[PDB]
């Protein structure tokens, strides 16, 4: 099954991004929304009551028009489709002192194909290093140090990872790459390796918004939008981001002769998404009132942390990207 939760996940994606952007004036942002969605959807498998309803709604789902089951099947079909190169996976790291409910184990296996790995969380230093090692392998070395030792303890950790390697259908010219000015703002200018290609490219000078954009494919199914807002107009353009805007852009894009200069990009985001998720309505999950009563029988759990790490390497051949989302739970 292909597109059933596209609308919800992409709404969540844009929303999260907009909230992340408003909480950071001058920094690079890079996130994998699908990883966050999958991580939180899996987590909801252990939730009940107000906790459950609030989380699924914050993830973009209308619970009066689609059941919890339908949502989880959608994430299952997503996972199957992903798992030149794309991989996506889920793991559950568990303390020996925690007996999971069978139906919960059944669900994470059925819908999310989660690995279940029994660790000892009494020594957070070793546990976190082990989990980190796991994420590093699964992302082929791209995501290191997802968890700190600085972090609180945990009794249970849920992890999603994503890795993606795309090859431009239209690579940039290696002989044309050179140092050029990158204007960070009016006053700040840096030197960056700037790629060039001269070719037929999908281009649109937007008449409704202060921006130009191009669209580019990867070999296979991947595609990418590069959007250049006018000087100082970044937040205007960001506010307009929506499925509808992408649809309007997609209708406006025309094959054109373009001298296309795009810098080599190497950026990486590290987020504690707690605050942002609360701004998005997802709140009870982080409190003592959290209902995690589908996970185990006789322990009261809450979420302490939702962490996200993503890395982007962009060059003349394509894109090397990875992402990973961790949720720690401990006894309230």
């Amino acid at each position: 099954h292909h597109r059933g939760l596209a609308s919800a996940n992409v709404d969540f994606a844009f929303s999260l991004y907009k909230h992340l952007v408003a909480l950071s004036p001058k920094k690079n942002i890079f996130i994998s929304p699908v990883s966050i969605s999958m991580a939180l959807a899996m987590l909801s498998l252990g939730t009940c009551g107000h906790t459950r309803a609030q989380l699924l709604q914050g993830l973009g789902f209308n619970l009066t028009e689609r059941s919890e089951t339908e949502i989880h099947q959608g994430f299952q079909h997503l996972h199957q489709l992903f798992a030149l190169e794309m991989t996506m996976g889920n793991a559950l790291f568990l303390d020996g002192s925690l007996e999971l409910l069978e139906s919960f184990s059944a669900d994470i296996a059925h819908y999310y194909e989660s690995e279940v790995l029994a660790m000892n969380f009494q020594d957070w230093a070793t546990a976190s290093r082990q989990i980190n090692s796991y994420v590093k392998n699964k992302t082929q070395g791209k995501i290191v140090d997802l968890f700190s030792g600085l972090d609180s303890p945990a009794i249970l950790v849920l992890v999603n990872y994503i890795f993606f390697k795309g090859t431009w259908t239209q690579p940039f010219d290696l002989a044309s790459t050179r140092e050029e000015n990158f204007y960070v703002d009016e006053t700040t200018v840096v030197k960056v390796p700037m790629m060039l290609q001269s070719s037929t490219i999908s281009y649109l000078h937007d008449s409704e918004l202060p921006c130009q954009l191009v669209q580019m494919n990867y070999v296979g199914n991947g595609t990418v939008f590069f959007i250049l807002p006018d000087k100082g107009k970044m937040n205007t353009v960001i506010a307009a981001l929506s499925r509808d805007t992408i649809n309007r852009w997609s209708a406006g894009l025309t094959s054109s002769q373009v001298d296309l200069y795009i810098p080599k990009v190497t950026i990486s985001g590290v987020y504690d998404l707690g605050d942002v998720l609360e701004e998005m309505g997802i709140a009870d999950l982080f409190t003592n009132q959290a209902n995690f009563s589908r996970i185990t029988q006789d322990a009261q759990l809450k979420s302490s942390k939702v962490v996200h790490k993503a890395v982007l390497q962009l060059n003349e051949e394509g894109v090397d990207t990875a992402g990973s989302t961790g949720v720690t739970l401990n006894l309230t």
């Binding site: 292909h2 596209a6 992409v10 994606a13 844009f14 991004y17 001058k26 690079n28 942002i29 996130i31 994998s32 929304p33 699908v34 997503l78 489709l81 993606f164 795309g166 050029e180 000015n181 990158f182 204007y183 960070v184 840096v190 030197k191 960056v192 700037m194 281009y203 130009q212 191009v214 494919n217 991947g222 595609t223 990418v224 939008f225 590069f226 959007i227 250049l228 807002p229 000087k231 970044m234 960001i238 981001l241 992408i246 054109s256 002769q257 373009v258 001298d259 296309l260 200069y261 795009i262 810098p263 080599k264 990009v265 190497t266 950026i267 993503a310 982007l312 962009l314 894109v319 990207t321």
Partner: protein
């Protein structure tokens, strides 16, 4: 006459799976290095 497009100021990257329409990656590039 070719359109000259220079991404030498803050810009947005959006990566999608054309098949499922998933938002795979979202970037705000303020400083690419």
């Amino acid at each position: 006459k070719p359109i000259i497009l220079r991404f030498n100021q803050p810009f947005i990257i959006m990566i999608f799976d054309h098949f499922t329409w998933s938002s795979l990656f979202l970037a705000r590039v303020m400083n690419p290095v």
